[PDB]
């Protein structure tokens, strides 16, 4: 009931999902005028990110992105509460305009963006319960640019042809999710925002790493061309492209940086 | 019942104005991937722009912008139809983030933007009738950067302290509107889009000049701090700031340029 293109696109989300027209919306443009160094921000620690290769994790095309389910055994230290993983997914552009990150830096998109979603497991029993609650979610965002082939991202991309259409699912063996993170994870942007998709709940603590990772031109094109938003039996297929939200207004508020 | 900030802000405009969630929406980011040089794009001619110093033209705070009424003897020649002037107005940011142009260039906002609104006088009798019809409108856009004082823009700005509140009106003596335009008007971006405010009609032929103009720090600050969205006797004033729409998705479509 929502898309990124056409009559049900992002300008209309607020009709059935009021929080999409509400407070604390994400994503945003990270730029000098709204940044402040905060010396009390501390480095995150990534625990249980090395998932067992003898276990398996479901990859799903949900019609909006490709998601990988993650175990609650995976968690972040360094926030006020323990946040445990629930899923990761990506956002990207299209072959003719391969600049589909959600966040921008100084007005610039990156090629794509990876989000690793966690929920506050000290307060809430599961992500669904946390999702619309105070302090419920924390998302790690990795900005992606074109460059060297990235074997670690290929551990996701090499399975995409098995989830081409909405609803399709495939298992992926465990691998080390930390390999998907950039250099100097200590350096990041942090702000209070929202889910970037309906329902747009204003319940996400965002951490956007300063430094991008690289994937090759061939990997980017593979991601942009692999998937469809529609079911196999849909008479009007739609390619999964440009599945990122435009940046939001961000006035009389601040993003905090862990680097001066 | 629409604003740029809060529950009646731009993500909610579609609830009130159907075209705001429709096709062909403006403004957009002007960037390499969606540009295409078109040698058929020849210089516009600005006719009747030298308004008589012996006449007065109405400046109005309409609660959303400051507009100057323009006579229908001003017109643009060079497009398929003649388009005659109806008004000009501005968009800007705020002192803490003085980057409130509507259009962006390679992801960068300029300080402000001037729009000179015209209607298709060959097809339609007046601007209101044209506004929701095929090829109804044509808007000229000038990007404004902060730098040197601009005597020509000060012919408008010098009256801002007499139109501080909604509904208030002042007279501006005629002057040569062409003085508001930048260097090398032959260089421009052209695309089909929409009004950037409700009702968001997709009926505008946009011409964005390549080169910005400059206004001083003091001029920009006056524009950002002189005006209120509310009436003179509200005990709860609302400043007129950040009156620009975020850039829209622009996919499977091109902006044509008169420069390479
Ligand atoms: C790709 O869509 C996103 C998404 F973009 C984001 S973002 N960018 O991190 O805010 C998400 F967080 C989620 N997942 C969250 C999971 C934890 C709470 C349970 C509710 C869903 C939110 C998802 S989703 O694939 O699950 C689809 C949700 C439709 O409501
Ligand atoms: C500042 O608001 C704008 C505006 F932003 C733009 S834009 N950026 O060029 O699309 C406008 F064109 C207009 N005027 C057009 C006048 C000709 C048609 C009649 C309907 C209004 C469109 C106006 S307005 O001040 O008149 C307020 C319109 C409220 O609906
Ligand atoms: Zn996401
Ligand atoms: Zn305008």
Residue numbers in the entry:
A (entry chain D), B (entry chain A): 4 to 263
Provide the publication's sentences verbatim:
The role of carbonic anhydrase isozyme IX (CAIX) in tumor cell survival, proliferation, migration, pH regulation, and cell-signaling pathways made this enzyme a promising therapeutic target in oncology. , Tumor cells primarily express two membrane-associated carbonic anhydrases, CAIX and CAXII. These isozymes belong to a family of zinc metalloenzymes that catalyze the reversible hydration of CO2 to form HCO3 – and H+. Although the active site is characterized by conserved amino acids between 12 isozymes, the amino acids further away from the zinc ion provide some variability. Crystal structures of CAIX and CAXII with five compounds by using soaking or cocrystallization were determined to confirm the binding mode of the ligands and reveal insights that govern enhanced affinity.
Four ligands in complexes with CAXII are of similar structures, contain a cyclooctylamine group at the 3-position and (3-hydroxypropyl)­sulfonyl tail at the 4-position, but vary in substituents at the 5-position: compound 9 has a (4-hydroxybutyl)­amino moiety, compound 10 - piperidinyl, compound 13 - methoxy, and compound 14 - ethoxy. The introduction of methoxy (compound 13) and ethoxy (compound 14) groups at the 5-position of fluorinated benzenesulfonamide 5c resulted in the most strongly binding compounds for CAIX, with the K d,obs reaching 4.5 pM at pH 7.0. Interestingly, cancer-related CAXII also interacts strongly with 13 and 14, exhibiting 0.05 nM and 0.11 nM binding affinities, respectively. The tight binding of 13 to CAIX was confirmed by the ITC experiment, the slope of the integrated binding curve at pH 7.0 was extremely steep not allowing accurate determination of K d, however at pH 10 we obtained quite reasonable ITC binding isotherm with K d,obs around 26 nM. Complexes of CAXII-13 and CAXII-14 each have four subunits in both duplicate structures, and the ligands adopt nearly identical conformations across all eight subunits. First, the meta cyclooctylamino group is positioned in a hydrophobic region of the active site, making the main contacts with A129-S130 (main chain), V119, S133, and side chains of L197 and L139. In the structure containing compound 13 with a meta-methoxy group, a water molecule is consistently found between the ligand and protein, forming hydrogen bonds with Y6 and H67, but without a water-mediated hydrogen bond. The hydroxyl tail is oriented against the backbone of P200–P201, forming a hydrogen bond with the main chain oxygen of P200 in most subunits. Interestingly, despite the bulkiness of synthesized di-meta-substituted compounds 10, 13, and 14, especially the first one compound 10, which possesses large piperidinyl and cyclooctylamino groups, ligands acquire quite similar binding poses in the soaked and cocrystallized complexes with CAXII.
